[PDB]
Swiss-Prot record, chain A:
Name under which the protein is recorded: Gamma-tubulin complex component 3
Chain's role: Component of the gamma-tubulin ring complex (gTuRC) which mediates microtubule nucleation. The gTuRC regulates the minus-end nucleation of alpha-beta tubulin heterodimers that grow into microtubule protafilaments, a critical step in centrosome duplication and spindle formation.
Tissue specificity remark: Ubiquitously expressed.
Residues that span the membrane, as ranges: none
Swiss-Prot record, chains B, D:
Transmembrane segments: none
Gene3D superfamilies xref list: Helix hairpin bin, Tubulin/FtsZ, C-terminal domain, Tubulin/FtsZ, GTPase domain
Gene field: TUBG1
GO molecular function, one term: identical protein binding
Annotated Pfam families: Tubulin, Tubulin_C
One GO CC term, this protein: ciliary basal body
Designated name of the protein: Tubulin gamma-1 chain
Species: Homo sapiens
From Swiss-Prot, chain C:
Residues of the full protein shown: 818 to 867 of 902
Family (UniProt): Belongs to the TUBGCP family.
Compartments (UniProt record): Cytoplasm, Cytoskeleton, Microtubule organizing center, Centrosome
Assembly information from the UniProt record: Component of the gamma-tubulin ring complex (gTuRC) consisting of TUBGCP2, TUBGCP3, TUBGCP4, TUBGCP5 and TUBGCP6 and gamma-tubulin TUBG1 or TUBG2. TUBGCP2, TUBGCP3, TUBGCP4, TUBGCP5 and TUBGCP6 assemble in a 5:5:2:1:1 stoichiometry; each is associated with a gamma-tubulin, thereby arranging 14 gamma-tubulins in a helical manner. Gamma-tubulin at the first position is blocked by TUBGCP3 at the last position, allowing 13 protafilaments to grow into a microtubule.
Protein's recorded name: Gamma-tubulin complex component 2
Tissues showing expression: Ubiquitously expressed.
Highest taxon listed in the record's lineage: Eukaryota
Gene name linked to the record: TUBGCP2
Endpoints of the signal sequence: none
Annotated organism of origin: Homo sapiens
Function of the molecule: Component of the gamma-tubulin ring complex (gTuRC) which mediates microtubule nucleation. The gTuRC regulates the minus-end nucleation of alpha-beta tubulin heterodimers that grow into microtubule protafilaments, a critical step in centrosome duplication and spindle formation. Plays a role in neuronal migration.
Disease entry from the Swiss-Prot or TrEMBL record: Cortical dysplasia, complex, with other brain malformations 15: An autosomal recessive disorder characterized by global developmental delay, variably impaired intellectual development, speech delay, facial dysmorphism, microcephaly, and varying degrees of cortical malformations including pachygyria, thin corpus callosum and subcortical band heterotopia. Most patients have generalized seizures.
Length: 110, 368, 44, 368
């Protein structure tokens, strides 16, 4: 979440979707929303290569409990991350996602 | 999200024009609205580049300047003329709001001292009625003058969702460390604050990526929505954090803070920030409200490569009530010296409520 | 004739909701739905 | 397949002559109808080379020009004189249609404002009666003037199988970005659209290789057969696709689209086209009919080597009904201000049906 500008727009577009239960959620729909955010925010001016790996994954309730980004990496660069950094980032990304919706709720009440 | 800025009166257009000149240089945008060759988020203010501005005699000075490729004195006269062109000026905003991707706010740059005082109060009522989900932040500037000063104060206390810049503290700082003795010289100082006020909306940061993030942090209650600014460099973060709490720099002519926001626009060390806050708590340089738990917030930023350590302070100080009494007291002296004239006392009534609201905020039992 | 046109509608629209169904379950092959639908139609 | 073009009235001959001048240069064909030395399909419009044209005072200006080697004001007078020379002018078309390999259509270039208004309405009735399998596409041009304007509208709503170009939007664009203040200067803009309208019939493409391919895609129902044009460059495909949806470029003085066709005449990248359409769906810059599934179509093309990125938009917008009310309303004002005079109200009756047909097309239950 070090970008901030991109995650702001991404939390405004997933609001109408994640409120529904997880059973009606299918991954093929959210990708069009993520792709829309990367186009509108400042993340468009970015290396096309790294943007090819950034996608969504569905953890396996409510839409605010199974959504998370993945950024899969394979090849030579995969010897630095080694399937454990990707099992640690997602362990972190939840705590930064919760502490981000618990704030945009409290600026909506305000 | 986007933000459309409105400039009213002679004061608005100039400090607005100096605001765009400073921002167009911060970014790699030439005065003819063409990107120069030579990462900074520029979609909030610029439309793919053209500024999202709505300007409202002084216009000719802007049209003759090299930046042409970039686009009475009674309060009653200002309020009346806005009523006559209601549909005209509301036709350029509607398309400006609709054509926008997802509108967020309405930054307003005006001075409460003649037409911008009235026409400004008029648009402030129409804006809230037309859209109730759109934030209206107003960069008002403090100076028949006592009358028009408090009349807009009535509208600014219920309509505007959120920054005062008083010319008196501008004149004092001008003669002290700038040696001016001039309008074109004080404007260089205010525009330095404006371009620094939204330095967390032009660069993708960790927190404060939305306009509602800067507002809801400081303003605890929708009545107490007046903030002041502090800007020191006219070195460690402890030096900047101490110089900002000096009343020689606060641009305002018991009492305590409600919440402070510090903006550090330098390349400072990111681990020493907690060390400075620790020494602030020990020496006790700032006092806060006793009722609610209040803290101080500090945020770092990155200066544009195309365009040293600076620092800005955004705080919600209860001492701002003092400024209102000066405007309030002068009115009563004029009310005994000279269709119904009932709109004034209603404004006089509601402004007194805010003043008592402030003085009751510094008590250990402000609740109820 | 007047009674068989409505039969084709129930027959052809049934196969199309099958095409849009299988073309959704994929990991292009996902941008085809944005080529079949544009108006949010066939949202059932 | 072939297409024979008919030019009626002063407006037709000029914009037709400028149409052939632009096309003869696009191809390697010298003004004296000889191929110059210096892959483009030229058999549809040219006969092995001579243009398949039927021109109908202004003729002398064409005969004196270097292109000589290439071949009242009442609507009743225009309709009457066509009845007298019915067999004469129908003898040059018959041989032009027969002599043709396999006729496909009848492009018509005329303005509804005096003889081309009447004589144009007359040929439109005879054409459909003589041949029911031949498409009649009419490049009408909008301006006793209100009368003749709607009379042809009666014929254009049942005879013509398919493009409006209104002079008002031509004058506005002329003074805005061309600085004309002239007939010879606006014609340079319309002919740029015509030569670009059939850019998918002069080059062998993947799809839209026939005139019935461009028509049946847009027109959903034979009553709703009025289209408008958009042409931006007076860079990626996203820039062009966004600039075409700006109402500052649409040549037309709730409401939604029925189908859009985008023509890209550049060397643009063929894989980024789907990426642009995706961002169009997200930002939601265009709204369509709610009843039937409508999509947007974009087609690429190749510019002639003998003769940069351009773009044209063909769309079927329900807002075109607004233009008809302007013509309709002005008539009723003239009907109260002054053999049987019953032909007018019949025309007035049928045009009102189309207007209600349009306003009912934008409802979620347009069917029945």
């Amino acid at each position: 979440l070090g970008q901030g500008d991109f995650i702001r727009h991404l939390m405004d577009l997933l609001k109408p979707e994640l409120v529904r239960p997880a059973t009606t959620l299918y991954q093929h729909n959210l990708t069009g929303i993520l792709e829309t955010a990367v186009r509108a925010t400042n993340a468009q001016f970015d290396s096309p290569e790294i943007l090819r790996r950034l996608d969504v994954r569905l953890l396996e309730d409510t839409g605010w409990d199974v959504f998370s980004l993945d950024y899969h990496v394979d090849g030579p660069i995969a010897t630095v991350f080694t399937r454990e950094c990707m099992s640690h980032y997602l362990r972190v990304f939840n705590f930064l996602w919760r502490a981000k919706r618990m704030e945009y709720i409290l600026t909506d009440i305000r | 999200r986007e933000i459309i800025t409105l400039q009213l009166g002679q004061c608005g257009n100039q400090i607005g024009f100096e605001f765009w000149k400073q921002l167009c240089a911060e970014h790699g945008i030439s005065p003819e609205g063409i990107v120069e060759e030579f990462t900074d988020r520029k979609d909030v203010f610029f439309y793919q580049y053209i500024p999202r501005a709505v300007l409202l005699r002084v216009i000719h000075s802007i049209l003759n300047s090299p930046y042409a490729k970039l686009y009475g004195n009674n309060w009653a006269s200002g309020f009346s003329q806005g009523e006559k062109i209601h549909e005209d000026i509301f036709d350029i905003i509607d398309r400006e709001a609709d054509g926008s991707d997802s509108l967020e706010g309405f930054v307003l740059c005006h001075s409460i001292a003649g037409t911008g005082s009235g026409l400004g109060s008029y648009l402030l009522e129409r804006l809230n009625d037309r859209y109730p989900k759109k934030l209206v932040q107003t960069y008002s500037v403090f100076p028949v003058q006592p009358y028009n000063s408090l009349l807009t104060l009535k509208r600014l206390t219920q309509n505007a969702d959120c920054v005062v810049l008083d010319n008196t503290a501008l004149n004092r700082i001008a003669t002290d460390r700038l040696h001016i003795q001039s309008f074109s010289q004080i404007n260089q100082l205010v525009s330095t604050i404006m371009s620094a006020s939204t330095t967390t909306l032009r660069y993708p940061g960790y927190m404060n990526n939305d306009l509602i993030g800067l507002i809801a942090s400081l303003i605890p209650t929708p009545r107490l929505h007046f903030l002041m600014t502090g800007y020191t460099p006219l070195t460690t973060v402890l030096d900047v954090m101490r110089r900002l709490l000096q009343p020689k720099n606060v641009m305002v002519s018991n009492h305590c803070y409600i919440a402070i926001l510090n903006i550090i626009q330098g390349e400072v060390d990111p681990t020493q920030v907690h060390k400075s806050l620790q020494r602030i708590r020990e020496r006790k340089l700032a006092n806060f409200i006793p009722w609610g738990p209040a803290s101080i917030q500090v945020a770092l930023s990155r200066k544009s490569p195309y365009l040293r350590v600076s620092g800005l302070m955004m705080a919600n100080h209860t001492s701002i009530s003092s400024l209102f009494e000066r405007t309030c007291r002068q009115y009563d002296k004029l009310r005994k010296r000279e269709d119904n004239f009932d709109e004034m006392d209603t404004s006089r009534e509601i402004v007194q409520q805010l003043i008592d609201e402030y003085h009751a905020a510094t008590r250990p039992d402000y609740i109820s | 004739f007047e009674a068989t046109i409505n039969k084709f509608d129930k027959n052809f629209s049934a196969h199309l909701l099958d095409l849009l169904a299988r073309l959704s379950i994929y990991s292009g092959m996902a941008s085809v739905i944005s080529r079949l639908d544009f108006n949010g139609f066939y949202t059932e």
